[PDB]
Amino acid sequence: QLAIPPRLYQICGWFIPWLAIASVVVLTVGWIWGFGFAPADYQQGNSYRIIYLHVPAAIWSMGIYASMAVAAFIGLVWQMKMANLAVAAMAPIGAVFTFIALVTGSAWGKPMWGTWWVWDARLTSELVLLFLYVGVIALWHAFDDRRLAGRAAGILVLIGVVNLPIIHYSVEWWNTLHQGSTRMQQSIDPAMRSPLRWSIFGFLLLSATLTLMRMRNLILLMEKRRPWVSE
Amino acid sequence: MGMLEARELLCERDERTLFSGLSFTLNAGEWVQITGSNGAGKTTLLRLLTGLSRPDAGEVLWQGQPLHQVRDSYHQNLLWIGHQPGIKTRLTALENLHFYHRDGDTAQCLEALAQAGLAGFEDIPVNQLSAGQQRRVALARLWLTRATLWILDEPFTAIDVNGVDRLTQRMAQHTEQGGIVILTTHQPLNVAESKIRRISLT
Amino acid sequence: MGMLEARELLCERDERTLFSGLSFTLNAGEWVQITGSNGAGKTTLLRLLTGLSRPDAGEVLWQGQPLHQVRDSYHQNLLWIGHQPGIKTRLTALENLHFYHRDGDTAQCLEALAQAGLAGFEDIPVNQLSAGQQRRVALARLWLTRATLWILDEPFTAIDVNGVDRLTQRMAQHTEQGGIVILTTHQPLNVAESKIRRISLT
Amino acid sequence: MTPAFASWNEFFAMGGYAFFVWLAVVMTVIPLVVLVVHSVMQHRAILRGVAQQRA
Amino acid sequence: MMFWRIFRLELRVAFRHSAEIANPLWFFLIVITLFPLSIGPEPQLLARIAPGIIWVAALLSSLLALERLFRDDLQDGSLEQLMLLPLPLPAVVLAKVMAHWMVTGLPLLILSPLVAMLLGMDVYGWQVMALTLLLGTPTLGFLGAPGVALTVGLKRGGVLLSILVLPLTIPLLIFATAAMDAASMHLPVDGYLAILGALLAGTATLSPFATAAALRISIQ
Amino acid sequence: MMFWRIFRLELRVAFRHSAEIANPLWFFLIVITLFPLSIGPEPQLLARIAPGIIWVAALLSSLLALERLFRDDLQDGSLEQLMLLPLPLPAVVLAKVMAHWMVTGLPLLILSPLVAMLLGMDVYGWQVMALTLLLGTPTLGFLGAPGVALTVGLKRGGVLLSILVLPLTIPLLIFATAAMDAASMHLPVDGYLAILGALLAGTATLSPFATAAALRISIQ
Ligand SMILES: Nc1ncnc2c1ncn2[C@@H]1O[C@H](COP(=O)(O)OP(=O)(O)NP(=O)(O)O)[C@@H](O)[C@H]1O
Ligand SMILES: Nc1ncnc2c1ncn2[C@@H]1O[C@H](COP(=O)(O)OP(=O)(O)NP(=O)(O)O)[C@@H](O)[C@H]1O
Ligand SMILES: [Mg+2]
Ligand SMILES: [Mg+2]
């Protein structure tokens, strides 16, 4: 059963503490397993430990945008208020993950490429995604009247997620056209696979906690006038 | 019976509720006026009636069906002139009104503008017309449209005392033909009280 | 001798001459209404008076010097509110009114906003104000400004009876001390006939 | 129990790629901590903003 | 009411908004002329960057011209079309987009023979460029329609519209420049025109509905 | 009155929330990234095209912000400043163009270090890029103001009104790109920097008067 009154504020506040504790514990375990306990790659040595910082961010940059698309779809067909606040709740987190992926990707390629920005498939497919996130965030912050930002934001998110596979495939083909190919398909090592899983799961829980807190903030911003905020 | 009907319309904007539990039926020949100050939801109610905006609660019914199901047979019988006139400023008066006419045009659009009071300004760009003559361009549609339902939002915004008389006489003979006029204005009507049906935003 | 004194003003749009030969001097404490049909040179005369537009053939004198020769001693004491209210639609009701005040203490701006009947809408963006609350934002400056000459062009365009009565009382008491109000209204004013000096377009 | 680095920050904290690895750590910790602090401060400021309008 | 009546009405309105539809053309000419001046008398480098600069100029010209698609409607007459004209709103959006393209994308195709000689292209290069502009500018209009429909109420002509639709045109730019570059080698280009046509067919169907939904959101 | 109040008012009209300040930065980033997707990822080629790319971005931003400058105010409040505000209309125009440069010119100057490595230029290239984006970008608001004021406010205006906005800024772009190319070639740039200083002194002295006269003529 789904009622979804601003009782959802209490439900969100119920999950934040345990979710935050679990996320912190998982991230710490996954980053102590790496960064000192996992083996080292033979080619690029200790620079390969950035996988635990870049792979989770890159994966969840797409994951959060997919969740935003699902939330926008739910809030469009069924005209649900809170399902449209879910887009604005996860948009800044997705933008931050895209920025983190971009930063950790460039600092990862600096030892090999020699410069801080080589136009690669990985680092540009995560740049158009950052552009989409920025567009959504800017659109949500430009409507004076709420309940219009969130429907317009939902429409923008749906339009972007329709175009997202096309853009990614075009970029993955654009790289093949000019350079002939990228360097090589990055491989994984069995002794260095579990810490990556744990770091990805930790990033998942961290994004969940962050979006719960942001959803609480947005719910208060929406119903800043109702008598149920008499507290 | 029940050409147009409102079914428990609710519209609340932020800390204020505009109206609650509105339920009125409008048969043929009704001259309905919305009453309120500059804060009540008169334009909001009219835009809920036209289908441009969706009500938070309740629904509007045309002839017995919701507005989203008959949105092709409803706009056939409908006439909205809101606070904004809805006419292109850079075009002349004729082709702005030529757009809204189905058939027989440029023989009847000239006659309508003559009745509105723009005889000789049919070929002058609207942006070069006065602030009141710009309203008369939009109000000239009252002499062309065959629509049964007129929903006007302050048609006497900047209309001369002579002009308001002609509009009042226009939407007084349209009614006994079998039309419906939903009016909202602040200047008093120059007609008897029995002719007008006041409804308030309770 | 005396404030604004139009001298044999002439202006013609297209081919018709709107007016030819106005010569009126407006001394202190006169309430004057520019009467005319919907299409005469009412707004055009007002823009000639405010100095925004140059007369076709003639000159208008403030305090003895033409309006291009002073341009600083005249805009200090002048308050024109035309058909367009002149308010930025994206800002709120406060910082928009804050711009037109001398310093904007926000103690007199709030007092004026509550005085014009727009109490409680002091922080809503003005584009969300309905249709006359937008005009009330523009007309709230009648309580802030110390200007001694008001060129008001159709201020009762979308204001209910209460707001019209309040504005009429404010203008009546302002013109009592030293003020001058040039007014163009199609709704007849509910004040004694001796108070208003009407001038027609000849 | 068994580290991939033999010793303390003499051996750890630089593996030949100290500037590049520790740039990623610092510049991923900073945005996340900024997000957390911003969310907490935003919630508290919204709550203080509720009581101020009760005046 | 009818589709063609709205199309002709918007053409008539756009032809009276002169000096606002000529600014995109001037910007296009300035952009396509600046770079051949930045590079000196070097023919080899010009033939490598000509497709890219041409299509970036086309993107930016369409971005400039997209401002007036729905701008002068919300003030007066964005409704009277949602509110009347029993023709479905997607069809109204289609008519408006067709009329906008006939004054935005069509002029860039008319000046294409004057560009292929300015940049020293051959006949086949101009043929491919014309086929690309003919199949690319309708896609530009259809993709830019939802972005201006969402931001028509915001009343900010500028950067906000340019960060909503510009990322959506990236595949169009990539494939268009790929086709034009492959034309320089006198290699058959049927594999890229097919992708451009697929993009045009895909956007020409969903964009009217997306823009209608956005306009309905923005009108309330 | 209080010219600075006009300046702060125009600043407020653009930005209402702290997160909306960064919109020009993202617009600039997207416009810059539009070129490598078309020209190619090769870094040496992008170094020679950097001046054209950045100045096309600056011109596009100035064009987009110029429409907001006067066309919006005409509908409601382009008056109440000729009629009020006892300070001369040239001062009002000066406030307008200064706020326009703050919303347009400043963000690209702030983003100058970031956009200098995406294109691959060195420190000298970035230095000359900053000195030309600080000394020539303010002009774009100045000499483009008289042109736009006539077009957006003169009813029944022909195409000739658009000849005073885009084709009037060609010398600015020509000298700026020549200076930047001389910078990339490692040549003395002061010969072109002294020229661009004269235009800034030459247009900031007369453009406010010219735009004031244009507004006076057009409002009538
Ligand atoms: N550019 C123009 N702007 C305004 N009026 C114009 C223009 N060109 C010609 N005119 C004519 O000027 C005459 C007077 O216009 P205006 O001054 O607006 O009249 P008004 O009687 O004040 N209008 P209103 O307030 O609605 O009753 C009309 O016949 C117009 O058509
Ligand atoms: N976006 C909005 N548009 C219009 N009204 C809004 C909006 N947001 C909130 N409102 C409120 O809607 C209420 C009613 O507006 P509206 O229906 O236009 O009133 P009205 O009585 O028709 N106005 P008026 O014609 O001047 O007498 C006002 O109290 C507004 O503050
Ligand atoms: Mg109303
Ligand atoms: Mg008038």
Numbering used by the authors:
A (entry chain C): 7 to 237
B (entry chain E), C (entry chain A): -1 to 200
D (entry chain D): 1 to 55
E (entry chain F), F (entry chain B): 1 to 220
Extract from the study:
The cytochrome c maturation system I, consisting of eight membrane proteins (CcmABCDEFGH), results in the attachment of heme to cysteine residues of cytochrome c proteins. CcmABCD represents an ABC transporter complex using the energy of ATP hydrolysis for the transfer of heme from one binding partner (CcmC) to another (CcmE). Our cryo-EM structures reveal that CcmA2B2 form a homodimer which is an ABC transporter analog. CcmC which harbors the heme-binding site is attached to two CcmBs with two coupling helices TM4 and TM5 on CcmC, respectively.
We describe high resolution cryo-EM structures of CcmABCD in an unbound form, in complex with inhibitor AMP-PNP, and in complex with ATP and heme. Only one major conformation is obtained for CcmABCD in complex with the ATP homolog AMP-PNP which shows a “full closed” inward-facing conformation. Superposition of each of the closed NBD states of CcmABCD indicate nearly identical structures (e.g., with two ATPs or two inorganic phosphates or two AMP-PNPs). Our structures also reveal substantial conformational changes upon binding of ATP (to CcmA) and heme (to CcmC): closed NBD conformation when bound with two inorganic phosphates, two ATPs or two AMP-PNPs; open NBD conformation when it is ligand-free; and semi-open NBD when bound with one ATP.
